[PDB]
Design a protein around this nucleic acid. Structure first.
Lengths: 125, 157, 99, 213, 143, 368, 63, 219
RNA sequence: CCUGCGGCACGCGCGCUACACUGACGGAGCCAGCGAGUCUAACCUUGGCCGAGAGGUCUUGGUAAUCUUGUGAAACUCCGUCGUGCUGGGGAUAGAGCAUUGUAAUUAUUGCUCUUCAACGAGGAAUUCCUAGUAAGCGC
């Protein structure tokens, strides 16, 4: 068949459904390349999972990401979350394990919000 | 044939399972009886069955801990045979039927906290009844999350 | 990764127990000490003779070399200097091993 | 002497990542222009409170800095300068306007004084933060100004406050916007020229504290 | 090695194609085109009365392209903005219907769109060609 | 119930309100507060040591509290939850603020470093993570699902490779150096992870019994399970005791049949150190014997040099060897007849650098 | 006008000081011997370095 | 006899209650939530904005509080008020008509804040005893015999009228003076769930549109 | 100005608006959540067509996770015009015309279109609300 891995990414009320499959090296968001994300200042907020680990590791894979919900900013925190999760859950499945712990230690030292959803649940004092 | 008749309703491995409970469920009443033969204003006796109804309610064989009459009348094997694990997986609507829950336990899809459980006939405490889930990365917890279109393979669900 | 320090034949590699430091020995006499977490060359040691083989001992970070002047040279892997030199053979040392 | 070959093929991608971005993977640069290396806090007692060790791309770390008492220190000060730019009811909750100002402001400091913008901003906060601040005493109904010293966290907090307020007030009715007048502040606060807002207003706070001590 | 309009950024495309339909010269901009305000809660007529109707057709073509079919009531809502009611709250108002209906009848004469079944308007195989063509021309602007 | 060791008696038996089970426990280093945790309640009860009342019911977890620990340096207690979130409590002095850190899988293992600045966790995915406290972020995590040996039981129906019985760790304890973690669970194996280099050092099989169940990876072609319950590293630090099914194990290094040299030159041989005693260079022959790190050369030169040059030698001894020399005196003087000679050394080491040892309190823990 | 830095050792508790002002034994950085009991204004902890325009005054209570 | 929801706690555990405000409150009523925060003991005031009623309920059962006090207003005059017992307990939406905020009057000082005695007058109906046992448990148990402030809940004419008083006892008579708010108050619906639930069983509901609506009392 | 309370020209309370360049205006970029919706009838309404607009009209989907609706909301973002002038900031007061709801619009129901272009240059003494996705901005 086709080796794929599906991971999610979630900020305020925005989901991000990133299918990652072995391919040629195209990275789409909503049927559009990742060089055309809307807010235009926060475009480097989604180049973080591309440029932190190194752009070589996207040479064989596809990143189809589709997002709904949220606003202009809180979608950009969802596509940077589901690309980081979609990359680091393909190396534990279909590529080598020692790749994954190199990635999971790379995204961690930069920003842990790439991986686990920082849930700002309330607190009563 | 009461022993067979409740082995079917709850699905039991050995037909001897019933009388393996009904020896305990009789042993409750024999301790209930001799604790009824002590005089009523005895601080042993007043302490001692309330000590026991704490345990038989935590395990969940009896519905309430107030009525003292339940301890001889409502303590039945079919009461203790529905805190079985496959009945609880049918009560919590995990599996569709009660045979099918035995099919999922024996194949190894269900767990209590850390460790998965493999004997079908695991008694589950009412306190521990909170913690039964599908075992993680299973093919039966993966299918559930596909129905709501909410898988997340970073969990490798 | 592809490391390039030697120019003659490399005749023994090892990595330490901690996966931090890496040694290599050439027939040009260079015993190069690598870092492996970073890719930096930690240092570089040159003995006299060409070096046929290396046996590292990962428990204590000592490694021994077999030279062509018929002597076993044992070099500490941390302090980067010859600790023991063993004379007494009279022809080529085939193989050896630590205890 | 010695070489490490870590990259083996020419890394080319199917999605074209531009020439200025692929070059940016060696060092992390602020706004892809400004290096955090060779940036030294030239005043001791202010290191561990001006945080320029961890480099950043844009000044938008959305992490939690309000929870602990001194968690506010590890904010990388370029962001900590943008956060104090959105202080007005016409301006609260608009950060992308403020970040677009600083990226336009840090360009101006280069064009005028070649050095670095980010070396100037660090050198601005070292100068304007006061060294002795005066407090009110009770004194039984007759209050006199009693002079004390000041904690180095307050030295940073009030320094950042005086620069952005000094920029927001000087660009009140002028053709010069917030972006340029703040660069008129930080350059002057770097020299301490006594022609900026904060170097003046520090020089009362260290003047008054000398008068009664 | 092949291009679709989706390979060209939104604005630079409607920018070069709106200046392609002006040099082309056959559009049929209707009779008014200097006096209308274009929308519901609009204030002023377009700031460029020269090249706006061609800016808007060049938008309308890139939009029906990417879609199956879209009608007139749909172009209004896309092109309607918020209307300032003054001292009353702002709300959404659809744009002017005659304008967007007269971009649709007028893009059927150059053949960039056609009547669809199911309703609406749909891009025509010829207009699918022209749009892909200038999606390359714009793509190649790099000398 | 608290117990005395001078008198062998309860002080007070602390109880809850509605009679809850208590799994685990955490004691204030300044022995004022005893905290405990349940499976029934998931509320952290807090008792004072003097008044047997419960001071407060610290709550906010979904799912039960697995473990509870207090860092001695900062006096902060960090809760363990099955909700996959680690919450650090701060309970002293008008603050009452709880900081929560999210975790990927149910955390059943909590370890507090001596420093008081790091927290070591053992989740259910196998992986052991190491968090900071003053920040919510993590330093790193170390991966423990592969290097765990798991038994196939007799009554099993699955391979030992893909059962999820034992691939996590139901205990963790930092060494008092703060550089190593020993972990142990319901598996057959104990581990020794290095904390900075993030790699395990050596893996210990607890037992090889066919009588116990969880031993064999592969059976030939109910019985009690073999698992380690709780593991701690001793203050003396020679060995870490792991509490097994077979009984409490003790591992150690009191053999020292091992050549672990330090800074050898070619000039340094065992005979050379003996020559120094003839030469009367006590300072050298001790350092020349510390370079081999062998105990019989050290006892040759430790017992040789006289009283009149003990403090001259103590001043001469370098700061780097001060932690090492103190540890050697600690293990030797317990079973050795020389009280008077050993105490003059510990007078001299303390007398020579009282301030240095006090300044590096973290550096010397096992030696003290 | 030379300025002498100082490192904070120990914040002082239970001293009756005017609110906002806290009281701190500092240690001189350039010579680790001395100490001077000065007052701070902002929020201060241990192990942070403080700036003194004058060394020899030693601040008392502020009522 | 106490109510079945309040039966397990009744005298044993003190209540802890939360006074919170509707959504973007006017500065008059944001004062007025503080008089409710002062009229009870064990009351904290958490300003509400961009909370939902689920995640303010659900993050309160978690932290463990007895009940929840939410207010509403019209143009600064507060109008409505609900008390909702949390562990699946009842709720009581009150309409309150005649209010006099404490910050209007004078800078006479500040309240006593000590445990109050209570006064419940003219509660005869069984539904009237529900309103007794749902209001009474908002105060900390067992007040002292000589505490000095007493909070009256008076029910003349179906409008529960609550005033706050201090008292001292002279050589012959008690002499009192008023501090704190004047209310009229009227409950109009009583769910068995919390105020989250919105489909719980309705124990009582003020019927307005009935031929005998004005006739009966507690109807 | 809106509103409540007093008073009977005014006193008081809750509020809305803007004084502008962190703006306005013109293009352009284009992202929410909670929600409601038609039977014995006229509901939410795409789409087409007509109208500068407001609206009109011919049709359609939906008793609804199904059709309206991805409610393409607004602040916000970019490019441009204006250039510190009660200015292009502000839109009160008012003239004239065109629409909508309604048996009925005069004392203007409301909407649209052109003209009219006021006070207000940050607000005395007073005083309100508020500790994290909150305050404030912003639309539904």
């Amino acid at each position: 068949a086709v080796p794929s891995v599906q991971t999610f990414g979630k900020k305020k009320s925005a989901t991000a459904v990133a299918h990652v499959k072995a391919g040629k090296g195209l990275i789409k968001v909503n049927g559009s390349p990742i060089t055309l994300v809307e807010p235009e200042i926060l475009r480097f907020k989604v180049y973080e999972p591309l440029l932190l680990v190194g752009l070589d590791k996207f040479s064989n894979i596809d990143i189809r990401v589709r997002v709904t919900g949220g606003g202009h900013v809180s979608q950009v925190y969802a596509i940077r979350q589901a690309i980081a999760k979609g990359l680091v859950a393909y190396h534990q499945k279909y590529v080598d394990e020692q790749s994954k712990n190199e990635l999971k230690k790379a995204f961690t030292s930069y920003d842990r919000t790439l991986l686990i959803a920082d849930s700002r649940r309330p607190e009563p004092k | 044939h009461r022993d067979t008749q409740v082995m079917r309703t709850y699905h039991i491995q050995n037909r001897e399972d019933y009388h393996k409970y009904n020896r305990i469920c009789g042993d409750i009443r024999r301790l209930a009886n001799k604790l009824s033969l002590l005089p009523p204003t005895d601080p042993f006796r007043r302490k001692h069955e309330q000590l026991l109804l704490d345990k038989l309610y935590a395990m969940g064989v009896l519905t309430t801990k107030s009525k003292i009459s339940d301890l001889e009348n409502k303590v039945t094997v079919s009461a203790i045979c529905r805190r079985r694990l496959p009945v609880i997986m049918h009560r919590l609507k995990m599996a569709e039927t009660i045979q099918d829950a035995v099919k999922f336990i024996e194949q190894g899809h269900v767990r209590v906290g850390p460790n998965l459980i493999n004997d079908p006939a695991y008694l589950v405490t009412r306190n521990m009844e909170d913690y039964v889930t599908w075992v993680d990365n299973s093919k039966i917890k993966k299918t559930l999350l596909r129905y709501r279109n909410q898988i997340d393979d970073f969990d490798f669900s | 990764k592809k490391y390039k320090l030697h120019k003659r034949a490399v005749t023994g590699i090892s990595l330490d127990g901690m996966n931090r430091k890496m040694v290599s020995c050439g027939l040009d006499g260079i015993v190069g000490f690598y870092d492996f977490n970073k890719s930096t060359l930690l240092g570089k040691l040159k003995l006299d003779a060409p070096i046929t083989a290396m046996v590292y001992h990962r428990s204590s970070d000592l490694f021994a070399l077999a030279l062509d002047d018929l002597s076993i040279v044992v070099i500490d892997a941390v302090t980067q200097r010859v600790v023991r030199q063993l004379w007494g053979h009279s022809n080529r040392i085939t193989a050896f091993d630590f205890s | 002497d010695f070489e490490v070959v870590e990259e083996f093929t020419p890394v080319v991608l199917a999605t074209p990542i531009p020439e200025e971005v692929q070059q940016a993977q060696t060092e992390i640069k602020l706004f892809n222009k400004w290096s955090f290396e060779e940036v030294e806090v030239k005043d001791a007692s202010l290191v561990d409170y001006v945080q320029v060790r961890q480099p950043i791309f844009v000044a938008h770390t959305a992490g939690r800095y309000a929870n602990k008492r001194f968690r506010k220190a590890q904010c990388p000060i370029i962001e900590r300068l943008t956060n104090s730019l959105m202080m007005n009811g016409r301006n609260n909750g608009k950060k992308l306007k403020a970040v677009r100002i600083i990226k336009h402001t840090l360009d101006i400091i280069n064009v005028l004084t070649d050095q670095n913008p980010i070396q100037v901003v660090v050198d601005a906060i070292t100068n304007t933060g006061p060294r002795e601040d005066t407090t009110r005493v009770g004194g039984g109904g007759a209050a006199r100004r009693q002079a004390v010293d000041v904690s180095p966290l307050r030295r940073v907090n009030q320094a950042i406050a005086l620069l952005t307020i000094g920029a927001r007030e000087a660009a009140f009715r002028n053709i010069k916007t917030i972006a340029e007048t703040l660069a008129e502040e930080l350059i002057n606060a770097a020299k301490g020229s006594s022609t900026s807002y904060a170097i003046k207003k520090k020089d009362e706070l260290e003047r008054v504290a000398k008068s009664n001590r | 090695p092949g291009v679709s309009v989706r390979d060209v950024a939104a604005q630079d495309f409607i920018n070069a194609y709106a200046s392609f339909l002006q040099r082309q010269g056959k559009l049929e901009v209707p009779g008014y085109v200097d006096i209308v305000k274009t929308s519901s809660g609009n204030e002023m007529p377009p700031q460029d009365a020269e090249g706006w109707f061609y800016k808007r057709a060049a938008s309308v073509a890139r939009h029906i392209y990417m879609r199956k079919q879209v009608g007139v009531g749909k172009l209004n809502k896309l092109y309607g903005g918020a209307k300032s009611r003054g001292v009353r709250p702002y709300k959404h108002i659809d744009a002017s219907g005659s304008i967007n209906r007269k971009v649709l009848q007028a893009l059927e004469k150059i053949g960039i769109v056609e009547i669809s079944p199911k309703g609406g308007r749909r891009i025509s195989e010829n207009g699918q060609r022209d749009l892909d063509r200038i999606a390359a021309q714009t793509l190649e602007e790099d000398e | 119930r608290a117990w005395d060791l001078i008198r062998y008696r309860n002080f007070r038996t602390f109880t809850g309100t509605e009679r809850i089970q208590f799994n685990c426990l955490a004691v204030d280093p300044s022995g004022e507060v005893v905290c405990a945790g349940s499976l029934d309640n998931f509320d952290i009860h807090v008792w004072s040591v003097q008044t047997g009342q419960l001071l407060d019911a610290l709550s906010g977890h979904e799912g039960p509290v697995s473990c509870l620990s207090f860092s001695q340096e900062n006096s902060v207690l960090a809760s363990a939850s099955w909700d996959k979130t680690i919450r650090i409590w701060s309970i002293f002095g008008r603050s009452q603020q709880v900081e929560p850190i999210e975790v990927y899988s149910d955390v059943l293992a909590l370890s507090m470093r001596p420093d008081g600045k790091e927290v070591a966790v053992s989740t259910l995915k196998g992986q052991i993570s190491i968090f900071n406290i003053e920040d919510a972020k993590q330093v790193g995590n170390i991966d423990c699902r592969k290097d765990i040996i798991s038994g196939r039981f007799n009554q099993d129906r699955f391979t030992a490779k893909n059962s999820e019985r034992s691939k996590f760790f139901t205990t963790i304890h930092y060494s008092f150096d703060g550089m190593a973690i020993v972990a142990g669970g319901n598996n057959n194996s104990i581990c020794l992870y290095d904390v900075p280099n993030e790699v395990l050092l050596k893996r210990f099989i607890v037992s090889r019994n066919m009588a116990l169940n969880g031993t064999l990876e592969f059976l030939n072609s109910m019985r009690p399970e073999v698992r380690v319950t709780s593991v701690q590293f001793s203050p003396t630090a020679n060995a870490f005791a792991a509490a097994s099914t077979e009984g409490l194990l003790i591992y150690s290094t009191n053999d020292t049949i091992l050549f672990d040299p330090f800074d050898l030159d070619v000039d340094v041989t065992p005979h050379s150190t003996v020559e120094a005693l003839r030469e009367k260079q006590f300072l050298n022959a001790l350092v020349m014997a510390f370079r081999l790190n062998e105990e019989y050369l050290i006892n040759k030169v430790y017992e040789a040099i006289p009283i009149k040059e003990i403090p001259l030698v103590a001043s001469n001894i370098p700061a780097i060897y001060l932690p090492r020399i103190l540890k050697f005196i600690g293990d030797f003087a317990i079973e050795s007849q020389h009280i008077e000679f050993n105490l003059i050394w510990i007078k001299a080491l303390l007398s020579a650098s009282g301030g240095y040892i006090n300044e590096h309190k973290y550096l010397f823990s096992t030696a003290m | 006008t030379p300025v002498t830095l100082a490192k904070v050792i120990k914040v002082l508790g239970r001293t009756g000081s005017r609110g906002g002002v806290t009281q701190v034994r500092v240690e001189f950085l350039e010579d680790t011997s001395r100490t001077i009991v000065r007052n701070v204004k902002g929020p201060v902890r241990e192990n942070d370095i403080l700036v003194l325009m004058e060394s020899e005054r030693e601040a008392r209570r502020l009522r | 006899q106490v109510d079945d929801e309040y039966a397990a706690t009744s005298g044993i555990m003190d209540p802890r209650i939360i006074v919170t405000t509707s959504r973007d409150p006017s500065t008059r009523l944001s004062q007025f939530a503080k008089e409710i925060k002062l009229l009870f003991p064990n009351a904290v005031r958490l300003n509400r904005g961009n909370y939902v009623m689920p995640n303010l309920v659900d993050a309160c059962k978690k932290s463990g509080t007895t009940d929840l006090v939410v207010l509403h207003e019209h143009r600064g005059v507060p109008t409505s008020l609900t008390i909702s017992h949390f562990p699946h307990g009842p709720t009581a939406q009150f309409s309150l008509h005649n209010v006099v905020m404490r910050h209007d009057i004078i800078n006479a000082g500040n309240q006593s804040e000590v445990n109050p005695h209570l006064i419940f007058d003219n509660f005869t109906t069984a539904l009237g005893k529900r309103v007794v046992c749902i209001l009474k448990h908002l105060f900390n148990a067992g007040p002292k015999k000589d505490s000095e402030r007493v909070i009256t809940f008076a029910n003349r004419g179906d409008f529960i009228s609550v005033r706050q008083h201090v008292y001292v006892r002279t050589r012959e008579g008690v002499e009192i003076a008023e501090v704190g708010p004047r209310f009229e108050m009227r409950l109009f619906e009583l769910r068995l769930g919390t105020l989250e639930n919105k489909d719980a069983d309705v124990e009582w509901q003020l019927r307005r549109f009935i031929r005998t609506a004005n006739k009966k009392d507690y109807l």
